[PDB]
Amino acid sequence: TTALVCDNGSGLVKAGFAGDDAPRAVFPSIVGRPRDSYVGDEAQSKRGILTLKYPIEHGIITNWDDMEKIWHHTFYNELRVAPEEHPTLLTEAPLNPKANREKMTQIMFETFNVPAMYVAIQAVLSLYASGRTTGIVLDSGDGVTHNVPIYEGYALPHAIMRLDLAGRDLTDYLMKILTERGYSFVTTAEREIVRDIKEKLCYVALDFENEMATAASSSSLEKSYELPDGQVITIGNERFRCPETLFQPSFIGMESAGIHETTYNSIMKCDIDIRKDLYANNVMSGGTTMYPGIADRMQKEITALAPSTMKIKIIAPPERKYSVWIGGSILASLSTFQQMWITKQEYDEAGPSIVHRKCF
Ligand SMILES: Nc1ncnc2c1ncn2[C@@H]1O[C@H](COP(=O)(O)OP(=O)(O)OP(=O)(O)O)[C@@H](O)[C@H]1O
Ligand SMILES: [Ca+2]
């Protein structure tokens, strides 16, 4: 039968069928229970009477009962499949604990009775989707941003870097600075509008201070945005101040290094034998890398940090919002991969620890 691919993130589930070019189901990774459980948009609609929780925090599954609900809902309600009929590829964060990976495996086989499964590293899937087995991935999602250097298909765990800021932070920051302008974006409905502004109108400046001067000197950078009630507002320097936070986390009160410095710092940790290959194969992935201008800015920033003679390249695939999912879709469809699934029989004999002998 067809394999399933489920890429569970902190903010969004991306799920579908291996061989498709995109996930069929993309929905909020949220479970609501009375203040008898509800998922995603149905939980958000009932937030007045439910306590909402996110079962994945910074990519890691932290609430297992709620994750079981997400997975059940995904199979039965979003995909409308019988999970016992389909091999299922799941994804994991960088540095996912062994015990976590084993528990995911056990749930798949014991709670959902899947015939087979696999767990792949999200960054490896994105690198693979880009046509590479060596490079360094910058994966910026809704909750977390990571740098994952990968050599000949293997993630280098000693050199993974984390930045505890991503898309939900940028949405909230945009609300804040738009409010400072004189608007009022404060309510949860107002958050949804601002996520839309963010995804439609924001961009990364090549030179932040130059761009500030331009925005303050003229209207050349302003855009209008029609609100749900029909009211038209103007977005100016907020277009690029919002994603500047990726490069300057101090904008939201964080002391952490920005994404250019985490990229550089990750590379430095890797064997000097492979540094030249990482610099020439920086691959962007995840929703929060979607800003226009981000590759150009990274290129400039890493150039400043690295030795002057280093060849540096930033690859930002058009389809990078879902490249984790797409890599999973391709991989699960390959003839060669079919020997790699962990089968129910194999799990029955070896137990959950079989999952660690994985090549993705
Ligand atoms: N075009 C866009 N421009 C800017 N941000 C975007 C765009 N599209 C999506 N995003 C943001 O990307 C985030 C979702 O990305 P993604 O699905 O990669 O995250 P995730 O897997 O849910 O989270 P994480 O990887 O942090 O666990 C949201 O915050 C969303 O607003
Ligand atoms: Ca993700």
UniProtKB/Swiss-Prot annotation:
One of its GO terms (biological process) is skeletal muscle thin filament assembly. The modification N6-malonyllysine is found at residue 46. Keywords: Acetylation, ADP-ribosylation, ATP-binding, Cytoplasm, Cytoskeleton, Hydrolase, Methylation, Muscle protein, Nucleotide-binding, Oxidation. It comes from the Eukaryota. The modification N6-methyllysine is found at residue 69. Pfam families: Actin. In vertebrates 3 main groups of actin isoforms, alpha, beta and gamma have been identified. The alpha actins are found in muscle tissues and are a major constituent of the contractile apparatus. The beta and gamma actins coexist in most cell types as components of the cytoskeleton and as mediators of internal cell motility. Actins are highly conserved proteins that are involved in various types of cell motility and are ubiquitously expressed in all eukaryotic cells. This is Actin, alpha skeletal muscle. It comes from Oryctolagus cuniculus (Rabbit). The lineage of its organism: Eukaryota, Metazoa, Chordata, Craniata, Vertebrata.
